[PDB]
């Protein structure tokens, strides 16, 4: 009965980010400590240890909300203002995250392109969703 | 009348020697004509 | 129109068909 | 000590200076007693104002 949308967005991402950190099976690129996630930003994320997993926490939820998602959508989704230019988020990190998730089985290559929420992942996201509520 | 009948939402009735009696008077009977004139008019 | 169009309303129709024809 | 007075009539054509309104007020302590006063803010009837001095009589301020 529990669903991801039934849980607060902030609570779910922090909880499942911790689970991903605790799980230890998410592949993390080496360059995480030296990247800033965009051109509009200025300095790398402060929570160097866990931002990548929590970055994976956010996109995995978006893939639940929207059945099909691509790297371009995530780039605009995490993009921000800089006249203003509205540069999109870094392509490399989003692509690595999507590859990282489907290794765990949370997501998988959607038809007609993009990533779909895997039924195993869908149950997994619901699992942590119930965890936060309980 | 006929145009009023055709254009009226509600019922419109049809509009209607020897000494003649005045059924209706413009002013009350006890009132006099002289009392009807202002001092300026006089 | 069953019973014809008024003079104002004939005029606008003539304008409409001309624009439609264009 | 301080008295409270309820406005009963907002006088007009008083020749008061701009932003000043001459009012007449009935003291709450003694309803009968009336005093004419000068007020700075927007004012209406039935409103209560504070008088530290209850002896001065309002003189118009041009």
């Amino acid at each position: 009965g529990v669903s991801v949308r039934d849980v607060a967005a902030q609570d779910f991402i922090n909880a499942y980010a911790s689970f991903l950190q605790r799980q230890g099976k998410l592949e993390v690129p080496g360059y995480v400590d030296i990247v800033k996630t965009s051109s509009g930003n200025e300095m790398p994320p402060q929570d160097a240890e866990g931002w990548f997993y929590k970055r994976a926490a956010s996109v995995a939820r978006h893939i639940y909300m929207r059945k099909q998602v691509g790297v371009g959508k995530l780039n605009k989704l995490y993009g921000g203002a800089k006249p203003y230019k509205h540069i999109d988020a870094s392509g490399s990190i989003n692509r690595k995250v999507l590859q990282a998730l489907e290794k765990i089985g949370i997501v998988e290559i959607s038809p007609k392109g993009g990533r779909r929420i895997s039924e195993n992942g869908q149950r997994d996201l619901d699992r942590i969703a119930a965890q936060t509520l309980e | 009348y006929k145009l009023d009948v055709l254009s009226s939402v509600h019922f419109v009735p049809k509009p209607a020697e020897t000494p003649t009696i005045s059924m209706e008077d413009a002013q009350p009977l006890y009132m006099s004509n002289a009392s009807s004139l202002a001092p300026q008019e006089i | 129109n069953p019973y014809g169009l008024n003079e104002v309303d004939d005029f606008a129709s003539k304008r409409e068909k001309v624009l439609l024809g264009q | 000590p301080v008295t409270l007075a309820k406005v009963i009539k907002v006088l007009g054509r008083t020749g008061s200076r701009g932003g000043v309104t001459q009012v007449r007020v009935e003291f709450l302590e003694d309803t009968s007693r009336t005093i004419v006063r000068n007020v700075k803010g927007p004012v209406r009837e039935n409103d209560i104002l504070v008088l530290m001095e209850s002896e001065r009589e309002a003189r118009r301020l041009r």
Binding site: - | - | E7, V8, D9, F11, A12, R15 | -
Partner: protein, 247 residues
């Protein structure tokens, strides 16, 4: 309500057509929009500007307000054009004046006559506002006398009709204030003067502002209706445009 405006617009588009035919037959008076209220009801004018006006355009709008005796200045903060025209039509205004600028330089002036047009658009050149005058003082707001010079063509008479009724009818014979619109090669010079009759002539002093106004569009409808039929428009890319006169 929406059935009012639709029906009346259709009547108006017809009435102008009949008036045009009647004039053409006469070719072989006051215009219909203004004939109803000509000299009966004093005009009611609203002067406004474009969104986020500069300080100068607000100053220029104020000067235009002083030019017309029955004008009121209205701030256009976020107002939507259908809402602006609809709200003004509710209030019973006769005319709406909208002003545009470029870096604090008045560029355009558009006049729309309610409830059903016409809309006249003008371009402002060599604009001089009275705020450029030191120790100028205050204006006189009596009803001006009007002087129109060198308006000959039918379009010229049309522009005369629109500008005439922005002011009140029946100025006093001895009013010291005169407003003049002088046509010179389609560039109408607008000047405002205060006069005194001397024992051997008349001496005039200008109050300002100075600006040259040229018509470039005239449509049969309110300024909102971008789809309103165009009564007249200025063609510039025509080979004869460099020497063609219309007014």
């Amino acid at each position: 309500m929406l059935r009012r405006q639709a029906r009346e617009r259709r009547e108006y588009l017809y009435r102008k057509a009949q008036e045009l035919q009647d004039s053409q037959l006469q070719q072989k008076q006051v215009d219909d929009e203004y004939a109803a209220t000509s000299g009966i009801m004093d005009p009611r004018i609203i002067v406004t500007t474009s969104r986020d006006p500069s300080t100068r355009l607000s100053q220029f709008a104020k000067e235009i307000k002083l030019l017309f005796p029955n004008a009121v200045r209205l701030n256009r903060g976020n107002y939507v054009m259908p809402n602006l025209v609809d709200a003004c039509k509710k209030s019973g205004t006769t005319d709406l004046v909208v002003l545009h600028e470029h870096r604090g330089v008045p560029t355009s002036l558009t006049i729309s006559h309610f409830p059903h047009g016409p809309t006249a658009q003008f371009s402002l050149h060599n604009v001089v506002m009275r705020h450029d005058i030191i120790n100028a003082g205050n204006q006189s707001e009596v009803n001006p006398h009007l002087i129109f010079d060198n308006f000959t063509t039918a379009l010229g008479k049309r522009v005369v009709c629109i500008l005439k009724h922005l002011f009140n009818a029946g100025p006093k014979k001895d009013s010291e204030r005169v407003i003049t619109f002088a046509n010179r090669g389609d560039f109408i010079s607008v000047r405002q003067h205060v006069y005194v009759r001397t024992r051997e002539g008349v001496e005039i002093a200008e109050v300002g502002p100075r600006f040259e106004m040229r018509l470039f569009e005239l449509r049969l409808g309110t300024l909102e209706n971008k789809d309103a039929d165009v009564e007249w428009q200025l063609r510039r890319f025509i080979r004869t445009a460099n020497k063609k006169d219309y007014l």
